[PDB]
Design a protein around this ligand. Structure first.
Ligand SMILES: N[C@@H](Cc1ccccc1)C(=O)O
Ligand SMILES: N[C@@H](Cc1ccccc1)C(=O)O
Ligand SMILES: N[C@@H](Cc1ccccc1)C(=O)O
Ligand SMILES: N[C@@H](Cc1ccccc1)C(=O)O
Ligand SMILES: [Mn+2]
Ligand SMILES: [Mn+2]
Ligand SMILES: [Mn+2]
Ligand SMILES: [Mn+2]
Lengths: 350, 350, 350, 350
């Protein structure tokens, strides 16, 4: 069908597997379904206060290899068990990082990292990976950049995050008010806290947004509202993790009529884009936690099997278990890190 | 179909008329299609620096009544023909205003302003309105809050705008890189200029984003980049229209390899939310324009048949031709203001 | 998507405008909707036994030109009004004739009679034609060859027929049990009556059949049973119209527990494929009717503006208002034949 | 969406999993794909006249239990391997038997035999069954009652049949002209042979028919013609298997330009609805074959693990391996009847 003045800047547009196809091929096993249900209920209590543990969303910056991802998941699953009594460990399974610039479009948009853009392969690979991880008993945390992807993966998400650059977007807020899991809004790029707070209030109400039915047709979604949303401090022009800021944030939250709780992102802006510094932020935060700090309900750490990152866009033989986006701490620091956190929660415990 | 851990916060979700249904029922008449082709070409020239005229996106804050909206159009169309050598008048046909708070969800989401949420009626009403306006010879400018609505109306848009709360959203940038019309990114809420500049650069590159085919099915869209994007100064905590700022902005664009050009929004934050102050901003801006400021390729004015706004909640029978969202200057000030700008453009010519 | 051992004999398969698109573009006008509502009730009243009037499905064998079709309609409409007291005239608007062999695939499958197979144009042309006809006051009768087409046109059909070659088809029976209009089953090709009788029974029950939603998705339809079905005698190896056969048929019907009512097809096998002989059948039948025969509720006549038939694959240009499938009596004989029936109906009455 | 005069006799209509969902969940394993490809090639050589082996479509009348069907399959696969130089054994996997009104609607329409009508469960169950059967090495033969089901299972069918009640239906002829597997048309109910002969010719040509894309959307299909179609003699008011009839048929075929070859159904009308008599028909037929009849390229036998049949309406636990539709010869007679047929084929060979 040819319409006038239509699709002028569209190189190409093609049907995507309908959600139902992905659900039918990779249905949630009984374990996977449990892992999800339980991890959601658990995060709900921590946010409701009825639990003194720390939510810990730790994992690779972005996932580009299911093999490494599942090995990583295996290790993280062990620690999840060990520190089970203090922490509620959840894997950060993110498939793409929003780039103002160019770069790899992620596991879903371009599974083969060769600009082939086999997105239907992406969905398959992505969903199977989440399915496997959840099946093994390890909950997963993911990000939601648009209003359509949720239909293919939300049911395997125990926790999700609306990034900094979209926290103020009405549509993303409306989306969050309909997600079946706890949502965490990041503070503005420059460090602005108001946006995230308003977001939290908006997510709590009922909304309408366009997306697609599980059969893939365009649809209007009417949400109920989501009360399990909290803020995520990822720094601005200067870190947000200091007790000085926590104090500030705790203020604004109550001022807005929302529980004074926050999650702290050791990476990104709080890490000054230096994966090494995540260990330092851990120091300051662990102290706050142990020194009787309750408002902090969770943290976020970018870690992989191998520290640092590597250039994919330079035509280099990628190394296994090493992030190809933001730099992540190695598995050594990750363990030490988690152990410290576990204790700071024990200290604080009283 | 019942899935585990699914749609826990979804009150309801229903099929939405596929785009093809709207296109088939309301196809572009030959006039409408010309109107759209021509006005897009015109704005392209102004943005390429080959037309000393001014792009003027003027019209109701939000449209809630096709009748008034069509009367308004008839009037604006007259001036459009009159001042056509100084200005390139384009009607602001917006259907909804993003709200944190509560409020009417707009003509599309709730055509009957009674929370009946007859969105399929919305699309028919909206698309038929744009169709009529364009058919009369008056181009229309709209805003795009999501990645799906475009499919139902973009072909009747001669110009579009990515609002302040979304200018930094990667998806909305990607979406802009695929629209068939010039796009205008607003500066951040607090006044931040960088976010709109980065946006402009990104929208010029080819991107991938999910949406739906004209047949209504979940699809992946590959754009080809949009070079007809510009910034829109709508003020921050303090107005942006002063030659002081304009000078800063022009510097930012040039430093980012972009043409020093800007559109100035007389309303919203530049008007301090006082519809009457739009007349004042007009003074200062007509000043710079007459003075020979060529970085100002266009302005935006919220105006209706009758000035001021009114409420829906009040229970009093809505007043004809009067905004139910942001306050707008009446038709009298409008005719006045347009004639000033007309002269200002002449001034900058001699 | 590439599947093994799949589509080996498919030259090509393409999406079809979803029904909703055709409904949105060509909604039934008031006059059209009523014309259908009244014609159905009226035919129902007849099958009920409370109307001595005769249902007369008369019209071109197949329609290939909207212009001649609407002229024909205009004329038939006049008579429809004139003989309103004795006959319930309904136009036969058939788009295709099932051919073992080759030949034109009909107005819908190939609107342009040039093998271009523009089916989406067919749907639009066909639907608009029925819409105009109805809007003028003339009900329409059509045939249903598959389970999908109904979704695009049934709402404009006041009466439908399941042809001889499909009367014994389970799917077509299930389909008829869900049509919103009276359905008429024809007796088998060789003259068999049992098949049509079983069909009338089966169609009276609720069934399940696959088709598509108004949105174009594959769906499961659950009908509620259709009690307005009757048999159509179209002859076998030798005509069926004689009182001898009528008598046997009425008996078979009662024997099967169904009302003893029949519709007689003057054309096809009862006419021995001799369009002229339709006038003779009219004589024998008008006789039974005038003689008190009440089981005859209706008749079917193939007639056009110009009698006879012409060949499409003959390459030769086409003569206006002349069938390109089965030969039809001209408009002169039509007006004559209709009036005869009118009188025969008066006879049976007064 | 509510339309005028629409869906008046529709109790309900719901989306059906799109084909792509079944294909994604149950993709053909390599073996299954081979089994299917090879058996189609084999049956092709037979019909082409380049193989003296006999095609044997034997199996339950209908399948209501995957577990027994798989046991049957295992037994039959063994004989398939043994008698492979004489017979090309293909399992009859039919899910439903057309009934005038009352009765179980089949494994697909009602998997749970409790009127729950879990058709999506049907497709999953049916497709998985065919998938496992083919994967084990046993080809499968099925029937196609509508134009939509093929999309979900045809890729697992090595041979298919158009039943007696639909052989004369144009849409089913068109559909056969597009199937990727050899098709068998059954003679009319009353024994008529012409209808199946015409069908074979029709299915040989290219046609158009509506159905749905693999994505589930209403679509128009353009076939390329099917040359691997043959007749199936299943008796009329009296059996068709006698050499007398086989002689008439062979003439009818040659008279129509078709190779004189037939498949003889030992069951149904040829068996006078007496499962025991299938053994008798086998006698007369093995006779003809052994006596040098090269026109008999195949036979069809209704057989299960246990002879006879049983009712659902009875209310007693169902017997394992026992038809709930037409009566079938049990397993012992099957091994018998096959071994006979094998020798006959061996006979005719020398
Ligand atoms: N299925 C999502 C909700 C959703 C519905 C529709 C569109 C987008 C998201 C969930 O369970 O979280
Ligand atoms: N059709 C739109 C572009 C578009 C396609 C697909 C999704 C979103 C937008 C235009 O002409 O601008
Ligand atoms: N819409 C048809 C019925 C129908 C529904 C679905 C499939 C086929 C037919 C009618 O009103 O008569
Ligand atoms: N896919 C089927 C053919 C088919 C396509 C579309 C509709 C119906 C049938 C086959 O391989 O035989
Ligand atoms: Mn990162
Ligand atoms: Mn406004
Ligand atoms: Mn005819
Ligand atoms: Mn049977």
């Amino acid at each position: 069908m040819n319409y006038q003045n239509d699709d002028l800047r569209i190189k190409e547009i093609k049907e995507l597997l309908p959600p139902v196809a992905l659900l039918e091929k990779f249905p949630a096993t009984e374990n996977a379904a449990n892992t999800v249900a339980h991890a959601r209920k658990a995060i709900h209590k921590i946010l409701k206060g009825n639990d003194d543990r720390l939510l810990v969303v730790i994992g690779p910056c972005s996932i580009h290899d299911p093999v490494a991802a599942k090995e990583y998941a295996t290790r993280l699953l062990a620690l999840r068990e060990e520190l089970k009594d203090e922490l509620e460990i959840v894997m950060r399974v993110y498939f793409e990082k929003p780039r103002t610039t160019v770069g790899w479009k992620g596991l879903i948009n371009d599974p083969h990292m060769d600009n082939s853009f086999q997105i239907n392969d992406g969905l398959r690979i992505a969903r199977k990976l989440l399915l496997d991880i959840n099946d093994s008993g390890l909950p997963a945390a993911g990000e939601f950049l648009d209003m359509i992807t949720p239909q293919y993966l939300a049911d395997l998400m125990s926790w999700g995050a609306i990034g900094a650059r979209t926290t103020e977007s009405q549509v993303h807020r409306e989306l969050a008010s309909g997600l079946s899991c706890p949502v965490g809004f990041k503070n503005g790029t420059d460090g602005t806290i108001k946006v995230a707070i308003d977001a939290i209030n908006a997510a709590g109400a009922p909304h309408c947004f366009l997306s697609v039915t599980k059969w893939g047709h365009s649809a209007i979604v009417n949400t109920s509202g989501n009360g399990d949303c909290h803020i995520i401090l990822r720094g601005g022009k200067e870190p947000n993790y200091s007790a000085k800021h926590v104090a500030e944030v705790k203020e604004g939250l109550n001022k807005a009529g929302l529980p004074a709780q926050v999650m702290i992102d050791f990476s990104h802006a709080n890490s000054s884009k230096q994966f090494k510094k995540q260990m330092d932020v851990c120091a300051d935060v662990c102290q706050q936690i142990a020194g009787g700090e309750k408002a902090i309900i969770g943290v976020m750490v970018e870690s992989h099997l191998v520290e640092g990152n590597q250039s994919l866009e330079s035509g280099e033989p990628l190394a296994y278990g090493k992030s190809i986006t933001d730099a992540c701490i190695g598995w050594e620091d990750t363990d030490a890190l988690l152990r410290q956190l576990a204790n700071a929660v024990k200290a604080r415990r009283g």
